[PDB]
Amino acid sequence: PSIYGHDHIKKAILLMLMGGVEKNLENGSHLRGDINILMVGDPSTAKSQLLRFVLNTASLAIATTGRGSSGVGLTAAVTTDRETGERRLEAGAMVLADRGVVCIDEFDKMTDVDRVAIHEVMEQQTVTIAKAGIHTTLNARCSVIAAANPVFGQYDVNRDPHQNIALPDSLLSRFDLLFVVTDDINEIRDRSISEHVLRTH
Amino acid sequence: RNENFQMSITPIKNLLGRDAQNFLLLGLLNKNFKGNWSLEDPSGSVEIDISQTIPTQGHYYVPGCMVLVEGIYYSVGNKFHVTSMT
DNA sequence: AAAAAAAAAAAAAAAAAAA
DNA sequence: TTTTTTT
Ligand SMILES: Nc1ncnc2c1ncn2[C@@H]1O[C@H](COP(=O)(O)OP(=O)(O)OP(=O)(O)O)[C@@H](O)[C@H]1O
Numbered sequence: 001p002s003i004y005g006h007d008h009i010k011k012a013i014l015l016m017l018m019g020g021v022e023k024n025l026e027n028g029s030h031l032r033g034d035i036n037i038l039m040v041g042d043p044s045t046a047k048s049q050l051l052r053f054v055l056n057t058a059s060l061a062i063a064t065t066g067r068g069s070s071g072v073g074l075t076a077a078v079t080t081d082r083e084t085g086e087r088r089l090e091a092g093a094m095v096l097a098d099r100g101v102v103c104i105d106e107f108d109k110m111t112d113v114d115r116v117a118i119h120e121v122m123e124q125q126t127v128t129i130a131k132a133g134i135h136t137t138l139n140a141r142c143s144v145i146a147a148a149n150p151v152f153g154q155y156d157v158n159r160d161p162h163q164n165i166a167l168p169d170s171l172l173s174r175f176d177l178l179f180v181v182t183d184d185i186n187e188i189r190d191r192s193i194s195e196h197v198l199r200t201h
Numbered sequence: 202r203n204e205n206f207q208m209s210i211t212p213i214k215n216l217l218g219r220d221a222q223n224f225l226l227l228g229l230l231n232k233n234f235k236g237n238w239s240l241e242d243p244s245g246s247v248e249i250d251i252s253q254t255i256p257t258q259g260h261y262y263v264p265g266c267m268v269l270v271e272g273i274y275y276s277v278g279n280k281f282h283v284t285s286m287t
Numbered sequence: 288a289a290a291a292a293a294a295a296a297a298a299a300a301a302a303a304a305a306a
Numbered sequence: 307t308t309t310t311t312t313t
């Protein structure tokens with residue numbers, strides 16, 4: 001309730017938290033079942049705050065940051081258990097959030113290499129680890145919510161939408177819903193949001 | 202301290218974010234640098250629309266006199282359309 | 288008497304590349 | 307020619 005406006009964003013979050021059913025066919029394999037939403041917009045328009053609210057509200061969720069993560073360390077790790085002296089796979093970040101939701105901040109500020117891993121988990125919701133004599137497929141059916149900054153300091157409304165985004169279309173087409181938020185400067189809205197913020201503090 | 206006033210006036214600077222609403226205010230009356238009629242308050246100053254003013258008779262409405270102004274703000278320009286003055 | 292090492296993360300210098 | 311990025 002402390003975030004002003006963005007009603008359609010709230011509706012999208014509500015629909016995402018309880019998405020559709022999975023479909024599996026004896027011949028048609030599998031169909032993806034939940035919803036993914038991406039946020040791109042001008043700075044200081046309350047995206048991280050809403051993402052934190054989604055973290056607290058949802059049942060199972062894990063928080064990730066683009067600059068503070070490594071792609072190989074995100075899915076699995078090869079570590080040796082102390083008591084047995086045998087090396088066994090260690091669960092990655094988004095594997096822990098299977099059937100839950102994973103929130104990523106500063107998404108566009110992530111290393112490009114890690115991005116390809118994301119595409120894999122957005123393709124068939126399954127990650128495969130083949131290394132050091134272990135060949136195993138791990139299930140990961142989580143949904144992803146993320147927010148990213150435009151290439152410039154602020155969004156340019158006169159340019160190509162592809163020009164304003166640093167991510168390739170290959171993974172951008174995967175996301176079901178994309179939202180663009182901009183703080184239009186209108187004194188009436190300024191006064192209203194000022195009243196709301198001062199009420200909050 | 203007046204008995205009747207316990208409606209309340211509003212400082213000038215608090216008139217930026219509203220329009221098409223009646224208010225009440227008071228302050229110095231003078232001519233701005235441009236040459237228009239303005240009301241000055243420690244908060245700030247606005248402009249005055251006089252084309253449909255009905256003043257209270259029996260007073261010498263003179264620049265430099267405290268006046269009570271009732272009118273409607275309009276954010277399209279910066280004109281506080283006055284309808285009464287005493 | 289001996290577990291000792293493949294897998295990661297982080298810090299450079301050189302070369303090549305783009306403006 | 308210069309700075310950048312990759313090995
Ligand atoms: N509609 C709003 N209601 C309440 N607070 C708002 C609103 N819009 C912006 N804010 C405030 O703006 C500030 C911006 O914080 P925050 O970093 O979360 O924003 P952001 O848009 O996600 O920014 P960034 O892209 O830099 O992470 C917060 O303190 C937040 O309270």
Ligand SMILES: [Mg+2]
Pocket residue numbers: 044045046047048049
């Ligand atoms: Mg933010």
